[PDB]
């Protein structure tokens, strides 16, 4: 019968063309594709200049060397804690950043 053969020629041609193109060249998921910081702290007594904090600090936060120099941090700290366990006397005192004038932002209006 010519019908089954004419609908098989289409089925083989439209498959071979797609296969050749692939070799050469869900609806829900498809549309998805288309559409407190802290800082360190060093007291005046727990630091004896054992230079361990500077030794373990990827950032240039702790400044100082030698002994009995009371090394202190800077604004570059990020609270990673690399200096916490480094200090044998536990001098690091990571604390939340305090609010100051330069870090003051306006508050959002309540509602309408």
């Amino acid at each position: 019968i010519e019908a089954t053969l004419a609908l098989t020629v289409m089925g083989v041609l439209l498959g071979c063309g797609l296969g050749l193109a692939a070799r050469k060249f869900g609806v829900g998921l498809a549309e998805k594709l288309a559409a407190a910081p802290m800082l360190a702290r060093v007291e005046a007594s727990q630091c004896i200049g054992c230079t361990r904090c500077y030794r373990a600090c990827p950032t240039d936060a702790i400044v100082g060397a030698s002994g009995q120099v009371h090394v202190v941090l800077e604004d570059a700290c990020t609270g990673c804690g690399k200096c916490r366990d480094a200090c044998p006397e536990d001098c690091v005192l990571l604390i939340p950043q305090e609010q100051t004038l330069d870090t003051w932002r306006w508050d959002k209006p309540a509602a309408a």
Binding site: G11, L14, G15, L18, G19, G26, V27, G28
Partner: protein, 213 residues
């Protein structure tokens, strides 16, 4: 448990209410509850048959031409359903019209055929198809009933001429002696009813979650 899919597909994953699919027949053939029930039954039968065929033919489909194969496996089946209900359910066929033929492109049918029927055995696919069809039928019946009550007052009307005299017990009348609001039957009345149903679903889901808490 195999029965888990059937229970979960009813409300947890509703085809027209959760996945936002099969909206064309949901909004088009909904002016009467009987139209929705017939369309839902036809879609359920097509889903069951296509899921069974795809799962039994699961380890035969090449990844790159997966669509034109499975679509064909859908399309022919749909054609048969057409040629069935055009011959022995002609009264219902004349009412649905184009949307009995537009089941091949029904997003729910192809989505279930691709997502679940290609990685599950035959029985889980059959149960998933039955559950999705039941959920679609329930949504269609609810929307059609609301629209028909608003537009005419009556519920499930001319069930006997469409679904057979055996269903004559379903013809009930609400709000007797009521001419009805004409806007509900019209296209502006379908989107609004669907949106209100979605809002009610969200509210009842929140309330049920609160009660469970």
């Amino acid at each position: 448990v195999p029965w888990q899919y059937f229970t979960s597909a009813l409300w947890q994953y509703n085809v027209a209410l959760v996945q936002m699919l099969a909206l064309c027949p949901t909004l088009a053939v909904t002016t009467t509850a009987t139209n929705g029930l017939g369309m839902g039954l036809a879609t359920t039968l097509v889903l069951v048959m296509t899921n069974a065929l795809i799962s039994s033919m699961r380890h035969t489909i090449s990844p790159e031409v997966r669509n034109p194969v499975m679509i064909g496996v859908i399309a022919g089946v749909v054609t048969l359903t057409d040629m069935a209900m055009n011959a022995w359910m002609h009264e219902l066929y004349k009412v649905l019209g184009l949307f009995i033929a537009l089941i091949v492109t029904n997003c729910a049918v192809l989505g279930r055929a691709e997502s679940f029927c290609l990685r599950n055995p035959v029985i889980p696919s059959i149960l998933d198809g039955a559950g999705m069809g039941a959920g679609f039928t329930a949504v269609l019946v609810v929307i059609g009933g609301i629209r028909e009550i608003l537009g005419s007052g009556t519920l499930f009307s001319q069930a006997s001429s469409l679904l057979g005299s055996h269903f004559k017990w379903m013809e009930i009348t609400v709000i007797p002696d009521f001419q009805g609001i004409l806007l509900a039957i019209l296209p502006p009345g379908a989107f609004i009813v669907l949106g209100f149903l979605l809002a009610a679903k969200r509210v009842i889901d929140r309330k049920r979650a609160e009660r469970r808490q």
